């Protein structure tokens, strides 16, 4: 089963930003979540996304619900995932 949780690093599999990495920062409902690249980092804008269009990775950072990009970027440093985000899958 697919599990999407706040802080999880995910990969987008649909849309122009396909193959890019992103961080889940909020939950809208059972079907949509909010992800942020951060944009300056991986090229993913801060938008809602349907769960069907993302796949979870094995990496997770710790943040609060609705975390800002700077808070996300800082948490990406305490985990050392900065170069993990710039890599494009497939």
């Amino acid at each position: 089963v697919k599990v999407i949780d706040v802080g999880r690093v995910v990969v987008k599999v649909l849309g122009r930003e396909a193959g890019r990495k992103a961080v889940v920062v909020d939950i809208v409902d059972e079907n949509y979540v909010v992800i942020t690249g951060p944009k300056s980092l991986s090229g993913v804008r801060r938008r809602r996304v349907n769960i069907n269009h993302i796949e979870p990775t094995d990496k997770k950072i710790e943040i609060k619900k609705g975390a800002s990009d700077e808070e996300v970027l800082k948490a990406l440093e305490a985990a050392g995932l900065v170069e993990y985000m710039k890599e494009r899958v497939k």
């Binding site: 697919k2 909020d26 939950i27 059972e30 769960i51």
Partner: protein
Amino acid sequence: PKIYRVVGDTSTGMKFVVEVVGERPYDALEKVYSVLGSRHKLKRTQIRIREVSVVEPSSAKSNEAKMLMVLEKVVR
């Protein structure tokens, strides 16, 4: 994410006040159109939205909306 209180009525004489969780009023209205269209066979022209307003989670009536607000994870 916010709870939107949507007040509306239909050409078929039905009235409704529902609470829908969404990012923006546009997303909440899309859920209202598709769900009412599904559950009552109502075309979008037959649905008249009269009022959309944010309601704080403390004062909402729907436990569905409250529970979505505090969700930390989803499963598919």
